[PDB]
């Protein structure tokens, strides 16, 4: 009940009680909030509520102290104080930014801009009240119950009246009754149990609603620039392989945490496991929000790092299928492969943290509330595709508000840049270059001219919001008959519907651009789909056409980015 002030840290017994985190406020502070916002309630050892029987008034700014106890204006004896007083609301131990955060609804970008231009505590205080926003919202949707089950991997679904029916992608898990997670796609829908079980009539579905803890740590520890390496002894018999990152491995040492942007193919893997080589005794801890990136670095540390001396954290609740060969769950290992959600309480000479863009303000606070370190290695790129907030309807989210990583990237600069892109050919690496990277992304590869675009709007048809463009995969299908080594290509779509649709009409592997993050394949085929601001966002554009290797086919429905992308124009 007593504690430290979010805003400037003074001591005080004053919580906001309309504050859905109910946040300890200063005497000067809780005024400040309570005269400028609807949060009139106060919490202290006991309500600031009137004490006179039958009485309602909660309205700290019509509340009076009269001998030790509360009263309004029309109970309050001769001898009272209003609590609200000389720009303070009494409390023990006797700004705008802080009420914008407390009463968003969090649908609003600008909310998301001031989470990330704010103070570090109002940083957290952001990440907390949003999240359990998020939470709450889930609550919302209408469970789903089982009417008949068609298959083994099909069934009929019965939606709750009055309440709203939650996005059927893999980015909305369901739970199952404890019958394990499940997920829905496309009356006919495509049902996947993580527990492979006999999908009885009856059981229902609902969205995991976790409660959302309170932090403690920054985003961000405070910079702390060294004179030499600290706490880490390099190697003087480093792999050429290697070479190029050793000025980059010894700033890392030589900072408290660092940044580093690596468009897409740049060596990001390649840099993070090459950190212990180059300090070959430090206890690296290995974290990434997703199970895919965490698997990632622990396929490059399978090739280039002892055994023995890696382990893989998974957690008892196993939602995917993850990395195999690694001893399971053993935190003192001198390299340890875990998800933001999983860490243990642990220490360690280098945190590396994967996929940067990906984290909110939340994750980067857990991580650094679980691992006490000497070094913390920031990977990945704002240029590539942020966390979804799934309460953000108005405006769009620039690369700079992703986390405070992808702030400081987008502001001073990334501490170390790696430059040249070694997975695609040379018209996708010049197209993104000048979209995203200011033309500081350098081709490795030659051009391949196996990279073409065809301006195509077709006919968008919707399942609900996800769009479908039957025609954009007409003209794919076209173009397979007379182009038969894309018959191994990967169909990428900004939407899991056109995904769906693509998979019966041309048999292709199907992936989102979401999804998509991280891999690379030698063929891809993109359609468009539809003109949004989704389909159009230069970010999932970025990562759209750097999936490929060697063959890209765009079937654009944008004038601009079709323009824009340097590859041969096919007719039809
Ligand atoms: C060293 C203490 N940490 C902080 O500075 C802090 C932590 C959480 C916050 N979020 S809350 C409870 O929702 O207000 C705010 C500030
Ligand atoms: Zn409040
Ligand atoms: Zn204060
Ligand atoms: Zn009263």
Known sequence: ?????????????????????????????????????????????????????????????????????????????????????NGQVFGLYKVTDFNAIATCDWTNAGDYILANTCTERLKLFAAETLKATEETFKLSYGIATVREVLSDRELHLSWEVGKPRPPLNRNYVFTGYQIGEYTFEKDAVVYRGTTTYKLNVGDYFVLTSHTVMPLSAPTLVPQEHYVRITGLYPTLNISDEFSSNVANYQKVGMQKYSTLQGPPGTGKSHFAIGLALYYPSARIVYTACSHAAVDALCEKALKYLPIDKCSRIIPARARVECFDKFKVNSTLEQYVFCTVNALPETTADIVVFDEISMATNYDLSVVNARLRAKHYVYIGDPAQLPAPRTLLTKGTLEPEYFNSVCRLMKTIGPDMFLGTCRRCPAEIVDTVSALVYDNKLKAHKDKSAQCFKMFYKGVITHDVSSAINRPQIGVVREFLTRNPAWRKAVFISPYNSQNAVASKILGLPTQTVDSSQGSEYDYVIFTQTTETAHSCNVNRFNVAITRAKVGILCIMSDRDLYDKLQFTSLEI
């Open 1 to 85: 009940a007593v504690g430290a002030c979010v805003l400037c840290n003074s001591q005080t017994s004053l919580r906001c009680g309309a504050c859905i985190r109910r946040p300890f406020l200063c005497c000067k502070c809780c005024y400040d909030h309570v005269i400028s916002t609807s949060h009139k309630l106060v919490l202290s050892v006991n309500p600031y509520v009137c004490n006179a029987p039958g009485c309602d008034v909660t309205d700290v700014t019509q509340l009076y102290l009269g001998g030790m106890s509360y009263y309004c204006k029309s109970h309050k004896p001769p001898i009272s104080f209003p609590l609200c007083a």
